[PDB]
DNA sequence: GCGGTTTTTTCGCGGGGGTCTGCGCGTTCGTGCGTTTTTGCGGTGCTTGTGCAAAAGAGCGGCCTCGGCACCGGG
C-alpha cells in the first residue's frame, strides 16, 4: 500500500492499471464500515464470510469463526436514540491480559444502509435461500446486521 | 351575568446573518496493562487431653431338749 498525497493518486493508478490491464475484484459476502464498538472501545469494519467474521481495526484485526459465536443480542438502549448489538464469543477475544467475551456494538436507530450480498445466484439458491435476503433495502443498519449474523452463524437473535 | 374599552395575542411576509454542517488534522482523556500495600481464609505440626474341680476339716448360726427353779391358788 502506497500513500500518494496531493490533488494525483488517481492518475498514478490509471497509468499503472493501463500498463498491465489490471482487473478489479470484489470479495466478502458483506462488509459494514465504521461500526462503533463500546467493547472493545474503538471503530471497526465488519467483513462477513461463509465460515468466519473479520473485524478490521486501525490497531487490531480479529478473525472470529462463525462456530465461536454463541449468542447474538439485539437490545434497544433506554435513551431511545441508540440500538445495541451484542455478540457472545467463545473463546473470548484477547488484547493482552483481560479479555472480551462480549462484543458490544452501538448503532444510531436512524442509521439506514442499503446492501447487496456478494453471492452468485447458484450459491444463494443452494445455501442461503430463506436464511438471507439477496438485497436489503434502505432499512436500519442494526436490523440488516442482525439478520446477516443470524443467517451466517445460524444463531437465534435474542 | 351583561355590556364596555383597548391591550396584546394571533397572522402573515420580507430580509439578515448567526448557527448548523461537511471536512480535515491533532490531542487528551477514556480504557486496558501492570502493579502496591494489605486483608483474609486456607492448611499444618504439635500441645494437651479423653472414654472405652473335687476332697476334706474347721467354724458357724439356729435351735431343741432338757434342768431346775419360782410361782399361783388354796387353807
Instruction: Determine contact, residues A56/A71, Cβ cutoff 8 Å.
Output: no
CB of A95 within 7 Å of some strand B atom:
yes
CB of A24 within 7 Å of some strand B atom:
no
Measured CA to CA, the distance from residue A11 to residue A129 in angstroms comes to 42
Stated in angstroms to one decimal place, the resolution of this structure is 3.6
CB of A41 within 7 Å of some strand B atom:
yes
Measured CA to CA, the distance from residue A143 to residue A59 in angstroms comes to 27
Measured CA to CA, the distance from residue A96 to residue A88 in angstroms comes to 19
Please indicate the experimental technique that yielded this structure.
cryo-EM
Residue A94 CA and nucleotide B56 C1' are separated, in Å, by 107
- Provide the positions of strand B that have an atom within 7 A of a protein CB: 30-34
- DSSP H helices, A47-140, are 121-123
Left (φ > 0), alpha (ψ -120 to 50) or beta: where does A120 sit? Answer: beta
Instruction: Determine contact, residues A62/A78, Cβ cutoff 8 Å.
Output: no
Amino acid at each position: 500500500r502506497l500513500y500518494v498525497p496531493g490533488q494525483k493518486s488517481q492518475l498514478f493508478y490509471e497509468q499503472l492499471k493501463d500498463k498491465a490491464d489490471f482487473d478489479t475484484t470484489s470479495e466478502a459476502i458483506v462488509s459494514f464500515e465504521d461500526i462503533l464498538f463500546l467493547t472493545p472501545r474503538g471503530r471497526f469494519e465488519i467483513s462477513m464470510y461463509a465460515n468466519n467474521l473479520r473485524l478490521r481495526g486501525q490497531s487490531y484485526d480479529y478473525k472470529i469463526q462463525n462456530k465461536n459465536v454463541l449468542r447474538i443480542f439485539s437490545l434497544p438502549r433506554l435513551d431511545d436514540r441508540h440500538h445495541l448489538v451484542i455478540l457472545q464469543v467463545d473463546p473470548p477475544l484477547r488484547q493482552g491480559q483481560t479479555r472480551y467475551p462480549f462484543l458490544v456494538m452501538q448503532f444510531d436507530r436512524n442509521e439506514e444502509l442499503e446492501v447487496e450480498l456478494n453471492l452468485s445466484d447458484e450459491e444463494y439458491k443452494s445455501k442461503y435461500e430463506g436464511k438471507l435476503n439477496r438485497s436489503y433495502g434502505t432499512d436500519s443498519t442494526y436490523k440488516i446486521l442482525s439478520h446477516c449474523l443470524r443467517g451466517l452463524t445460524e444463531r437465534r437473535v435474542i
